[PDB]
Write an enzyme that holds these catalytic residues in place. Structure first.
Site, PDB file in Angstrom:
ATOM      1  N   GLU A 175      -5.959   7.522  -4.771  1.00 30.22           N
ATOM      2  CA  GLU A 175      -6.026   8.710  -3.928  1.00 30.22           C
ATOM      3  C   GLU A 175      -7.170   9.613  -4.389  1.00 30.22           C
ATOM      4  O   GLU A 175      -7.891  10.186  -3.597  1.00 30.22           O
ATOM      5  CB  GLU A 175      -4.712   9.521  -3.967  1.00 30.22           C
ATOM      6  CG  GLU A 175      -3.465   8.761  -3.653  1.00 30.22           C
ATOM      7  CD  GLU A 175      -3.348   8.257  -2.226  1.00 30.22           C
ATOM      8  OE1 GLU A 175      -4.314   8.283  -1.426  1.00 30.22           O
ATOM      9  OE2 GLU A 175      -2.233   7.771  -1.931  1.00 30.22           O
ATOM     10  N   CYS A 215       0.815  -1.220   0.000  1.00 35.01           N
ATOM     11  CA  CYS A 215       0.000   0.000   0.000  1.00 35.01           C
ATOM     12  C   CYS A 215       0.862   1.290   0.000  1.00 35.01           C
ATOM     13  O   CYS A 215       1.558   1.543  -0.975  1.00 35.01           O
ATOM     14  CB  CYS A 215      -1.026  -0.081   1.133  1.00 35.01           C
ATOM     15  SG  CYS A 215      -2.351   1.177   1.156  1.00 35.01           S
ATOM     16  N   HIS A 216       0.735   2.155   1.016  1.00 34.36           N
ATOM     17  CA  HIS A 216       1.602   3.322   1.104  1.00 34.36           C
ATOM     18  C   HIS A 216       2.941   2.973   1.753  1.00 34.36           C
ATOM     19  O   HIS A 216       3.764   3.856   1.925  1.00 34.36           O
ATOM     20  CB  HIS A 216       0.930   4.426   1.901  1.00 34.36           C
ATOM     21  CG  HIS A 216      -0.257   5.018   1.218  1.00 34.36           C
ATOM     22  ND1 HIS A 216      -1.545   4.614   1.487  1.00 34.36           N
ATOM     23  CD2 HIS A 216      -0.344   5.920   0.217  1.00 34.36           C
ATOM     24  CE1 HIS A 216      -2.385   5.288   0.722  1.00 34.36           C
ATOM     25  NE2 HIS A 216      -1.679   6.085  -0.063  1.00 34.36           N
TER      26      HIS A 216
END
EC number: 4.2.1.130
Lengths: 235, 235
Positions: B169, B137-138
């Site tokens: 996003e 993910c991030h």
């Protein structure tokens, strides 16, 4: 310039498997991409090294060919069959008509694609011209000898690709067949020319990669997504 | 050497979303990998920059936290919760105990991971020592400043990674939030340091990449496969 895909087929169609079945074109690797390109308003021209082709006989199994796919395959009046009837040889096609070069497969590609200079030239031009080169399954055999005209290096050198897995050849019990025929796997081809082979988790997974305008997929379950990716890579 | 994973968590846990909800640890990005590592007989130590953490409040939604995951999350007697209670700070851990560095995420990682020098050093050592660096993910925010000790270059330079998508996003309506806070997306980070960002077809797809011993995944649906890949990359 017309909106067009050049959809390459293996021209190899000989006895291959231990049961005596022939390899050839993996039906849904042609049919799913054909359907996908058509939904997005592309015209599709089929091409093979010899202008002929036959079906991979294991790809006619009902886990690989069923439902509307099977109906389209059996109906000689289908768009798929009428377009297939217009299959061309490489000298008959015009590369700036095409924004996408899509290489379908089946194990037959391991025989003809590495040697298909004329098809490789066409793919190079489409790429040089801003288009997308895409290949599913054993389709990346066509990268063996495919040169990026602008660098003089193999097109896949320093690129990330996927394609049919070595572990999958083993599951299908064809690795000794491949060895006996002195054939190289997609992983063999990637390593030889300095490409990064990015594997799926499992060998039958719908798995595909977009590396700029070079788009690859693993297997028959990836044919649709490989087509979608090739369109998205255009934009 | 014990069979161990160091499972990194964001320590950021402030108000973030337009509804006033806090970001933090995306629960299943910790829990699914924890479960996967345990099935394969690995011990798991949690770590964050501050030794503390809070949950991303949008990750508690029932489409993201349900079934046995929710039961394990609510049961303070669960292995997951008892192990989380033992969370450490970076100076308290020993890198040659660990074969895998797994970076969980949530949007909080965009705040602390780029600045987490101490966590980056540990990850470098595990990698230098033959281990696997993985992020979902991030999570790839932790690659911003992470150096391969042997080349002196950014670890991700010339590597192929995936991670949370810019398009995602936008769907979540947080791009203006990210801009206002001067944060960089995973795609921003990849471009800046010369990594190849390989996108999924769709932003929520289970999609993950193994580039040698550098393993990445896109989103919460990819947490499990990112864990599986990290184990397979060891062998």
């Amino acid at each position: 310039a017309p909106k067009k895909v050049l959809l390459a087929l293996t021209s190899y169609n000989d006895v291959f498997y231990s049961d005596g079945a022939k390899t050839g074109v993996f039906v849904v690797e042609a049919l799913h991409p054909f359907n996908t390109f058509r939904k997005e308003g592309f015209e599709v021209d089929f091409v093979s090294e010899t202008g002929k082709f036959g079906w991979d006989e294991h790809s006619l199994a009902k886990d690989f060919l069923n439902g509307q796919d099977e109906t389209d395959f059996k109906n000689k009046d289908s768009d798929f069959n009428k377009t297939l009837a217009k299959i061309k040889t490489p000298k008959e096609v015009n590369a700036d008509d095409y924004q996408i070069f899509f290489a379908s497969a089946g194990h037959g590609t391991l025989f003809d694609y590495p040697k298909a200079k004329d098809l490789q030239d066409i793919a190079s031009e489409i790429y040089a011209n801003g288009g997308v080169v895409a290949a599913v399954c054993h389709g990346p055999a066509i990268f063996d000898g495919l040169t990026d005209k602008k660098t003089g290096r193999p097109l896949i050198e320093g690129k990330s690709i996927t394609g049919f897995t070595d572990v999958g050849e083993t599951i299908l019990g064809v690795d000794s067949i491949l060895k006996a025929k002195n054939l190289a796997t997609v992983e063999d081809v990637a390593k030889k020319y300095g490409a990064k082979y990015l594997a799926p988790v499992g060998p039958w997974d719908d798995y595909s990669i977009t590396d700029g305008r070079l788009v690859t997929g693993v297997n028959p379950a990836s044919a649709h997504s490989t087509a979608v990716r090739s369109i998205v890579a255009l934009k």
